[PDB]
């Protein structure tokens, strides 16, 4: 089962500049080239190319809605297609609203794929509850059945079949989460492990509770959607919104280790990641490079080693 | 129960910059309007007025006996105020001797509370073991029932009155106590998780053992002395006595987060927050928001989330 | 129990800087007088002069062979006689190739010895393995007996006798392992704690399990190797081959503190110190205090506290 990389150069769905160079910052580490010394056959499909809507006003207080509709319609056709192609797609891209077609295009092959969302946020506040109007704090809104009608609708995303239930995702990483969302997760029961349970349980317990829960009944296709902004400030700073109290490098590689055990990674995500709010250039060096590390891990590189 | 916070701007404790700036380096962050936003109300007790004593001259090695030992008083009667008035005060101030009067105070109200101390040091020097004379390393030793008649009386610590047992308190961050401490906590037999006991068990069976050893039996007012040098310097910088290897951010929120849920919380204490030993403008800043957010958790804000 | 230590200020076991200085910047920390300060009675060899050999040309890939392997001659004998006396050695050496003199000469007295390996490398490339020819990377391949005759005699190494079996030495820390080591870790079942393990089981279960191995059914001598750049480069910046994700402060203390607690240390290695690699001043004095600092904790320094 090859991989297919594809580049999502996207913005729109936050206000700071500069996400849409995450795929060239993390293809110039050499991820590609990295990607293929690994046992897994590699293809480029090279970046989208999104174009903005015209007259896209906001639709209430959501920003961009019809660009950002758009893009992720675009991206929803390029992962459905790979899928279908029994390859594992990654997207590199600009903001997390991006999850919308990864995950859709990914679900619509795989029906019954389950995701595993590791952040610092839900990004789970809907067109009504929002109080910032960016898309990519909304994606698992338009992706959760639960919530589907909950708000009204969005110019842009008409295309969207809500894919996935609140009980095929699980969240690690929770740590900055607004009232709204709280809400939402809480009464949907939707399984999360907030850095408390993490501090709890340890990486090593959250992972096996993961998959029990995940994977439990019946085994089913992995959607990893990867925020890098989910690790601690203080591997991945370069990123739109850093909170303190994160993941460690370590358990960054620990989830993409045993994922890779599982042999169920079907499609995958690495977000945020932006090049231009490196404090020094250091900071996107180490951004850049805990980005590509988990990628191959969950390709197989793993820190005890490799051979043939 | 409503919240109180006093200001106690005292640095007489130690020489190291100046560490009144603390209270008033807290509030800056606006500490006071996001404790409202938590389901507690809040009063602003302002900060106490220290009348320094004359001539004041050390006590064979103690410096500054009368004017340390009188700051507390004020202190201590302003806190056994607010701990009748059925609230739960909440000390701010500058280094760690002022334990002696909010705590003193709050066993007036309260002599069945038990103490959890979070500190990278014991500072249970006794007036003959210290090896510096300041006095920011010897509050336990004027609170402890078990070290009167150890030491020659302090001028100006008549007042203080042995208010915990040596099974009534639990140090929680240990890793630089100096030889007479260690000597102390060990034949007394006093109940502490230095980092070795936390590397060993992990924060989450920490706490466990913690609530099970003073709680075990009958449920208390639990006293809080949270000293930020508890926190490993990367995240506590401006404080007077730093030391590598302490307890991480994610470890100080989840001691704080599990005793809110105990809804013991009858006293605490953030200490030893000096704004002016900053290296540089981000590392006060880093330091403050640290214990503001560990004064929040206190009360109720978690990292999974909150909402009305 | 008396402690001497052995200064082996070398180099030719790997290109960098000048980790012969090592000895003398550990020296410079005040290791002698903190480790006189213990309950154990210290001693100091000196360094130990090195005879450069005259065309010490490559053989095959391995660089500078007859130096490397005649300098280990002469620590082998040294560490040999100091052992014999019945006290406890510390070499402080440049490069990890002078584990093969530590070892070899400490196996000749205590030829049951166990040897616990802290690095983020396994350092077992045989020279036909190796892809640098570095000796520092190839030391365990000298030691042990499941090697011997897999790979050809090295000029200068006659002298060596395997003397620890693959099951007698256990690995902490790995996280940089070739196809080459990895196969043969692999193949000749070796037991070790890569940082995956780690971060599954918790340090403290790591040194349970290392014992339960090392010493369940025989009590013997350990010799402890412990290269710098086990621990995470935040922490031991100083040295020629970082890689991030590595044990903390926190860990490297409490592995040392658990190894101390045994009561069988008889060997200790405290390598890779380059005082010149350091990108400022201060990171080599970052690197060199914490080397310090374990080698203190080896002879009962503990974080809990220690008096007379
Ligand atoms: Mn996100
Ligand atoms: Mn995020
Ligand atoms: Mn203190
Ligand atoms: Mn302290
Ligand atoms: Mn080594
Ligand atoms: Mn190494």
Chains 1, 2, 3 share one sequence.
Request: glycine letters at 10%.
């Amino acid at each position: 089962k090859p991989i297919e990389i594809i580049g999502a150069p996207f913005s729109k769905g936050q206000p700071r500049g500069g996400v849409e160079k995450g795929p060239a910052a993390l293809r110039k580490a050499g991820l590609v080239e990295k990607l293929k010394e690994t046992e897994y056959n590699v293809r480029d499909h090279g970046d989208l190319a999104f174009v903005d809507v015209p007259n896209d006003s906001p639709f209430q207080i959501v920003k961009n809605p019809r660009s950002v509709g758009k893009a992720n319609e675009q991206l929803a056709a390029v992962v459905a297609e790979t899928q279908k192609n029994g390859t594992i797609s990654v997207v590199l891209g600009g903001d997390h609203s991006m999850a919308i077609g990864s995950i859709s295009g990914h679900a619509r092959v795989h029906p019954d794929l389950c995701v595993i969302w590791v952040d610092a946020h839900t990004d789970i506040a809907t067109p009504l509850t929002t109080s910032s109007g960016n898309l990519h704090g909304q994606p698992v809104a338009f992706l959760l059945k639960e919530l589907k009608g909950k708000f009204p609708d969005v110019p842009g995303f008409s295309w969207v079949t809500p894919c996935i239930s609140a009980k095929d995702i699980v969240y690690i990483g929770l740590r900055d989460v607004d009232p709204g969302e709280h809400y939402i997760i809480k009464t949907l029961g939707i399984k999360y492990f907030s850095m408390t349970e993490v501090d709890k349980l340890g990486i090593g317990k959250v992972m096996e509770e993961t998959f029990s829960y995940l994977l439990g009944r019946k085994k089913r296709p992995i959607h990893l959607s990867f925020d890098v902004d989910g690790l601690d400030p203080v591997f991945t700073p370069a990123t739109g919104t850093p909170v303190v109290g994160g993941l460690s490098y370590r358990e960054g590689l620990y989830i993409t280790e045993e994922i890779y055990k599982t042999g169920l990674l079907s499609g995958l995500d690495i977000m945020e990641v932006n090049p231009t709010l490196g404090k020094t250039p250091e900071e996107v060096t180490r951004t850049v490079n805990t980005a590509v590390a988990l990628t191959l891990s969950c390709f197989g590189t793993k820190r005890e080693g490799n051979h043939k």
